[PDB]
Design a protein around this nucleic acid. Structure first.
Ligand SMILES: [Zn+2]
Length: 300
RNA sequence: CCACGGUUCGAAUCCGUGGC
């Protein structure tokens, strides 16, 4: 049984859960999940967690994302994309220079409102559910950050570009917002999530077309996940102790790597096996206290 | 099981929290 993360590619059409079903059917296991939904009309990178890998999917939430999007100026729909009923389809007579200034006026930070068609919860209910019943909810804004925009291409009313965005940012809302800035409306007609953190679409695997053998050999083992977090190695003797319960103390450790206050760290051992994930208690600086507090432990 | 929440929308279904 494999345990880890799978950089999947979700074709345009199916929901993100559909990909989970496909992988859970191909690998004959119910323990599968993803770490960030991707709209059906969209395609691109979908982080998939297999078995014990599901237990670490939460750590992919705060990663940055890079998208390629094409929006239709003059078009506005209920869902903010081309799969939703049209509400208004007028002409957008604006110059290419205006379009660019409008697009780039969003580079930086701004308060973005979640689209009505989203998985956000309002009062014990998903927004897309309340939206399909005709009830449109305007949730308080979230201060999102647009790190950078580039590759702007203008072909009539259809404008495309790439954007690196902070976690929790909706490109759907971004398009509508840029359209609003131009005063003529805009809807996302194509969306490709090219990367989630260090994971790119180039590495992604189309589970729908891959065989169980290929999907299995593509799975990144737990020992090679969350590569960006400080690591620590304890004596192979301390293994089964932590790999069961207890905590992690100053004289169990063996190797450095600097952390912060409540920063998360990977706990390995002599044999390189990833024992668990602990949350730092104090900044790393040289004594028998709580160095790290277990926040998750994997048993295999 | 219940309640709440998370995640770029059709996750009962993955994750987290509190209660039982
Ligand atoms: Zn694609």
């Amino acid at each position: 049984m494999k345990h880890g993360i799978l950089v999947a590619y979700k074709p345009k059409g199916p929901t993100s859960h559909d990909v989970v079903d496909e992988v859970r059917k191909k690998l004959k296991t119910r323990k599968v999940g993803h770490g960030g939904t991707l709209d059906p009309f969209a395609c691109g990178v979908l982080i998939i967690g297999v078995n014990q890998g599901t237990r670490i999917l939460e750590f992919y939430k705060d990663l940055k994302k890079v998208f390629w999007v094409k929006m239709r100026l003059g078009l506005i729909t209920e869902t903010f994309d081309i799969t939703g009923e049209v509400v208004e389809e007028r002409e957008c007579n604006v110059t290419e220079e205006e379009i660019r200034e409008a697009i780039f006026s969003f580079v930086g930070e701004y308060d973005q409102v979640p689209p009505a068609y989203s998985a956000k919860k309002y009062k014990g209910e998903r927004l897309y559910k309340l939206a399909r019943e005709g009830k449109i909810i305007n949730l308080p804004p979230k201060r999102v950050k647009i790190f950078k925009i580039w590759d702007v291409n203008i072909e009539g009313r259809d404008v495309s570009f790439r954007v690196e965005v902070s976690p929790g940012t909706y490109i759907r809302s971004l398009c509508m917002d840029i359209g609003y800035k131009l005063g003529c409306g805009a809807t996302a007609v194509e969306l490709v999530r090219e990367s989630v953190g260090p994971h790119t679409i180039e590495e992604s695997l189309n589970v729908f077309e891959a065989a169980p053998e290929e999907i299995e050999n593509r799975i990144i083992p737990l020992e090679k996940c969350l590569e960006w977090l400080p690591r620590v190695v304890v004596h192979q003797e301390s293994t089964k102790m932590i790999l069961n319960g207890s905590q992690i103390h100053l004289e169990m450790l063996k190797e450095w790597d600097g952390f912060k206050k409540g920063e998360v760290v990977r706990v390995f051992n002599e044999e390189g096996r990833l024992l668990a994930l602990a949350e730092a208690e104090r900044n790393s600086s040289f004594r028998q206290e709580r160095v790290l507090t277990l926040r998750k432990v994997f048993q295999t």
